[PDB]
Design a binder for this molecule. Structure first.
Ligand SMILES: Cc1cc2nc3c(=O)[nH]c(=O)nc-3n(C[C@H](O)[C@H](O)[C@H](O)COP(=O)(O)O)c2cc1C
Ligand SMILES: Cc1cc2nc3c(=O)[nH]c(=O)nc-3n(C[C@H](O)[C@H](O)[C@H](O)COP(=O)(O)O)c2cc1C
Lengths: 202, 205
């Protein structure tokens, strides 16, 4: 079932691409795709070097894709420097890719608090203990610090570096594999105000 | 299933090989033992002149001592971006073992003799569709494209390599190897080019 998945929207696309993104994620859940929200997120520094890492996005709203990270991380510094990001979903089970490219906009502090509060107690402990992407000086010390934080046995406050971003799409591409190699490619791009769609050669 | 997706062994975290490609190859070989599905599916990111980034999956052909070899159309979006700005980053992620590998570098075009060999190693149906398609250009008539690919296959003549079909080597200046840990202190090993040598660092998760 990794080829020729149903894609009626290829010929009749929704006005907004986030609508199709949500529909695809729902079908992925029905197909029991493993970790469908694991997004390969690329960012860049100003000189143009690009970096990448997996991010499991938190949610989707009508304006974009929400994720959280440490602002002092490597991706954090790059998001602050240039703003540009490109996230890629790829589901091996269904032969589908979704590319979401645009600007990552920092969320408000109330939104950051909500993102932190939503997570588990063990997550809070290591995320409070670790300064993501800084050099690790002493593995044993960092483990012990996370364990001491966990043992406080109460809800830990949000570290100031723990922040959310909304990836606001400027362009999105949907790709669905075809057994005859003529893959279905649907591209959305911002043309002044609104969305222009096109089908692409494979 | 032959592994959990946490706590895979990673002895190189505390004693890294001098060259990161050596570790990349070891990881890919272990990924095959672990029966990882499509381990070579690389999320390849490129950028245009103004810094806008785009990404897509590429399945790389091979790995030599200098980098990761892949093929694509030079006139595709990625091909134009590589020509414009050079920098690229590729990400591998294996759900079955909890591992990711980040390869950041420049894509160096291969020689024409290498491109010819790569085209020869492909099937005639691949030749026909690759010849009939201008990757990433607007598709105006789908049935026409399908029909032209079928015509090329039916001729039974050797199909020439279109000049747009080319290979690149992604040559790293930076790599990171990441392996999940159940206690959340994930193993993170960064390689950065340092002249003719490499420098390594362990990172906080
Ligand atoms: C499945 C998966 C999900 C992840 N989700 C996040 C996440 O939501 N936020 C985050 O900061 N890192 C997440 N990570 C860790 C990142 O891949 C990366 O290691 C970390 O964010 C540091 O990246 P950087 O050094 O490029 O800034 C996740 C990793 C995996 C494998
Ligand atoms: C599993 C997988 C492997 C792929 N391998 C390649 C490849 O080796 N070369 C290629 O040009 N496109 C490959 N593609 C298609 C790309 O994802 C993408 O559609 C394409 O190359 C056009 O990208 P662009 O418009 O960003 O240039 C692959 C897609 C998938 C899902």
């Amino acid at each position: 079932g990794s080829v020729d998945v149903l894609f009626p929207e290829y010929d009749d696309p929704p006005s907004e691409p986030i609508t199709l993104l949500k529909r695809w994620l729902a079908t992925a859940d029905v197909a029991r795709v493993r970790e469908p929200k694991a997004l390969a997120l690329a960012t860049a520094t100003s000189d143009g070097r690009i970096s990448s890492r997996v991010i499991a996005f938190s949610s989707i709203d009508d304006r974009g894709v929400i994720f959280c990270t440490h602002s002092t991380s490597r991706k954090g510094r790059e998001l602050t420097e240039t703003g540009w990001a490109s996230g890629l979903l790829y589901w091996r089970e269904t032969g589908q890719q979704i590319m979401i490219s645009g600007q990552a906009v920092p969320l408000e502090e109330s939104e950051n608090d909500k993102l932190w509060f939503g997570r588990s107690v063990p997550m809070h402990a290591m995320s409070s203990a670790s300064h993501q992407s800084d050099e690790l000086v002493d593995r044993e010390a960092l483990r012990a610090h996370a364990a001491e934080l966990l043992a406080l046995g109460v809800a830990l406050p949000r570290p100031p570096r723990f922040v959310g971003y909304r990836l606001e799409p400027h362009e999105m591409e949907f790709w669905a594999a075809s057994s005859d190699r003529l893959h279905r490619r649907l591209r959305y791009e911002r043309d002044g105000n609104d969305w222009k769609t096109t089908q692409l050669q494979p």
